[PDB]
Amino acid sequence: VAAVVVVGSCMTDLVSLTSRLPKTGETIHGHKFFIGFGGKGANQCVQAARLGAMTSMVCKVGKDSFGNDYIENLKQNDISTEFTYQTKDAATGTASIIVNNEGQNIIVIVAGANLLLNTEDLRAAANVISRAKVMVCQLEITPATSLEALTMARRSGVKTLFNPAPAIADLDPQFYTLSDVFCCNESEAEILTGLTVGSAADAGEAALVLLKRGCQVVIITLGAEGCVVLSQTEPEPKHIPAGDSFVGALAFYLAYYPNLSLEDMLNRSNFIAAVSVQAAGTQSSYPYKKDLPLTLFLEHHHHHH
Amino acid sequence: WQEEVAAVVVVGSCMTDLVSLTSRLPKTGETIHGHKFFIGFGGKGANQCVQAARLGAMTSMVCKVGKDSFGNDYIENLKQNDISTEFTYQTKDAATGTASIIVNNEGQNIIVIVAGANLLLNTEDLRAAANVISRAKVMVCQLEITPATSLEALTMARRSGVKTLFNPAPAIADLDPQFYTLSDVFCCNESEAEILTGLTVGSAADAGEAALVLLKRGCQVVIITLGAEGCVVLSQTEPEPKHIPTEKVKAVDTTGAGDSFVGALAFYLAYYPNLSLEDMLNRSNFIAAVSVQAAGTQSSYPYKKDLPLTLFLE
Numbered sequence: 001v002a003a004v005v006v007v008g009s010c011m012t013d014l015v016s017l018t019s020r021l022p023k024t025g026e027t028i029h030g031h032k033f034f035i036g037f038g039g040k041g042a043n044q045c046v047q048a049a050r051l052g053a054m055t056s057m058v059c060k061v062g063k064d065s066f067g068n069d070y071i072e073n074l075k076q077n078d079i080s081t082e083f084t085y086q087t088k089d090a091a092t093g094t095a096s097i098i099v100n101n102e103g104q105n106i107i108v109i110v111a112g113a114n115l116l117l118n119t120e121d122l123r124a125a126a127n128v129i130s131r132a133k134v135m136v137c138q139l140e141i142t143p144a145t146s147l148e149a150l151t152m153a154r155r156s157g158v159k160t161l162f163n164p165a166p167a168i169a170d171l172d173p174q175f176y177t178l179s180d181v182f183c184c185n186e187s188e189a190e191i192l193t194g195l196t197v198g199s200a201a202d203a204g205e206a207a208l209v210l211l212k213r214g215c216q217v218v219i220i221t222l223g224a225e226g227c228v229v230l231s232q233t234e235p236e237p238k239h240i241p242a243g244d245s246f247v248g249a250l251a252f253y254l255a256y257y258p259n260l261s262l263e264d265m266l267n268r269s270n271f272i273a274a275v276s277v278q279a280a281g282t283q284s285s286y287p288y289k290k291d292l293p294l295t296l297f298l299e300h301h302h303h304h305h
Numbered sequence: 306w307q308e309e310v311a312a313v314v315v316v317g318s319c320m321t322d323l324v325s326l327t328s329r330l331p332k333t334g335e336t337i338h339g340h341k342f343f344i345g346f347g348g349k350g351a352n353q354c355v356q357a358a359r360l361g362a363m364t365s366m367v368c369k370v371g372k373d374s375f376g377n378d379y380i381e382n383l384k385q386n387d388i389s390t391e392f393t394y395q396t397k398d399a400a401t402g403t404a405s406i407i408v409n410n411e412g413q414n415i416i417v418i419v420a421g422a423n424l425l426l427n428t429e430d431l432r433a434a435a436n437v438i439s440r441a442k443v444m445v446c447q448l449e450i451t452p453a454t455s456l457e458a459l460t461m462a463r464r465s466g467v468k469t470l471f472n473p474a475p476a477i478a479d480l481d482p483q484f485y486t487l488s489d490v491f492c493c494n495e496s497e498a499e500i501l502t503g504l505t506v507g508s509a510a511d512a513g514e515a516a517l518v519l520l521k522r523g524c525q526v527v528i529i530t531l532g533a534e535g536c537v538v539l540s541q542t543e544p545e546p547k548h549i550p551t552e553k554v555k556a557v558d559t560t561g562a563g564d565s566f567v568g569a570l571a572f573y574l575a576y577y578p579n580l581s582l583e584d585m586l587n588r589s590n591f592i593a594a595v596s597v598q599a600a601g602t603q604s605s606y607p608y609k610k611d612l613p614l615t616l617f618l619e
């Protein structure tokens with residue numbers, strides 16, 4: 001029975017490497033191509049599943065070979081695809097990336113079938129939504145669909161973890177009140193608040209704005225510098241001194257380790273994100289439970305660390 | 306009773322086209338959002354083989370793809386176009402060839418090709434095809450596999466008395482001289498002829514002077530294509546350029562029009578050997594022009610049944 005349900009996006013990364021970037025009208029011969037699995041929703045789902053969560057991916061891909069390939073990737077990671085939809089009306093989402101020998105790139109994103117995931121689709125998935133322990137949402141599908149997913153979780157008492165990524169100025173105010181845990185990065189927080197965010201001190205001031213819009217808990221991530229947290233019952237910023245790995249891990253802990261303090265969950269999730277950064281690649285770099293330190297999965301009183 | 310012998314063998318490339326449509330092309334360092342993404346089956350060899358097959362040729366595609374989902378999908382495409390895949394090889398040692406394509410609202414594009422498994426088509430893989438090549442009427446080769454593999458395919462055809470149709474695309478300055486001498490029909494476009502001859506080519510008149518250089522390198526017949534403006538032909542017994550023009554028209558999408566033309570010509574060389582070159586070229590120009598009126602490269606290639614009956618008369 002899925003404890004973590006993710007409503008969000010799946011995207012295929014298509015990468016070519018070339019000596020130089022092409023000029024208009026030019027064909028250039030590359031020396032390497034590869035495919036990688038992405039999308040914030042998928043990536044967050046995959047990290048949670050690798051840690052041992054029972055997860056379900058609510059999303060929409062194309063009735064095409066990339067979408068069939070995505071479905072197999074979710075199944076290989078032990079994720080339920082019962083509400084992974086396939087549509088003939090758009091292609092599976094893509095990120096095409098060309099990179100030259102100087103590390104300069106060009107990137108073309110087509111969100112495709114992700115934008116077609118709608119209310120009717122979420123309604124069909126009510127049983128898994130209502131019965132989960134945590135619902136995770138981002139902003140790579142139609143915002144209205146994310147909203148409705150958060151609204152459905154709330155009506156069943158399911159904990160809402162929201163990642164407003166990519167961010168948007170003029171986000172619906174309902175988003176803040178529907179979010180039990182609202183987690184974003186520095187740049188995102190600048191878009192959402194129109195403040196500048198450079199230090200951990202600025203982050204704390206930006207978090208407080210978001211907290212005052214109605215979020216229960218706000219977390220602002222600081223890259224490889226940790227994160228800053230506030231809550232309605234503790235409004236003072238606490239500084240705790242890859243993004244999808246962190247959010248996936250936090251989902252896992254919210255669903256399976258409710259007896260941990262926020263501070264501890266965030267430590268463990270920072271640790272797990274840092275492991276993903278060291279390993280080459282993207283979703284493949286996400287660590288499994290068996291390859292991580294066993295203290296990540298024990299109560300505080302059980303270990304000597 | 307006897308299976309139908311392949312009259313056209315294409316030794317050449319297959320690649321998956323990964324196309325994104327956008328408003329404007331990205332500048333260096335830029336991420337942009339596109340409106341649509343389209344997968345298509347491409348590669349100059351396969352495209353030429355598909356046109357020929359759609360016109361009614363019995364064809365065999367000698368090529369190498371991956372043991373990946375793109376290669377599996379490519380084999381099914383070939384079979385759906387009635388092409389023999391007996392020598393469509395699959396390898397775990399590389400991925401299927403790709404073309405990653407961005408197109409703007411004006412039809413301008415940037416393209417990054419990775420050859421992949423096309424590079425791994427090798428001497429042993431050709432040798433297995435010896436009986437099919439011996440019984441063919443025409444062998445068609447391009448430059449999208451290892452130039453040594455195309456060379457061998459052309460020498461195999463020549464030693465078996467099979468007509469060679471060679472499309473030096475993409476072109477390369479200082480191409481091996483054997484390529485000209487092994488070509489019965491040598492067909493390329495304006496830009497390709499400039500790369501090969503170091504001459505400029507803008508008009509049909511310039512095209513004719515470039516063709517005569519290529520003719521003197523030992524080609525039997527040379528055709529220089531002029532995009533939607535037809536083509537120019539010369540031959541050893543008729544060295545004077547003939548300009549075979551077309552009607553000016555708005556295009557829908559010209560992508561793959563060149564390969565349409567070469568595939569049509571292969572079909573005619575094999576199945577209508579008694580037509581004059583002038584007539585074959587007219588009919589092939591016409592067929593290429595039909596493809597331009599539809600989108601999506603191979604999907605735009607016309608079937609026999611949808612074309613005017615005069616294209617198939619003697």
Ligand SMILES: [Cl-]
Nearest residue numbers: 431432435461
């Ligand atoms: Cl031999």
Ligand code: NA
Nearest residue numbers: 276279281285
């Ligand atoms: Na990584």
Ligand code: NA
Nearest residue numbers: 558596599605
């Ligand atoms: Na076309």
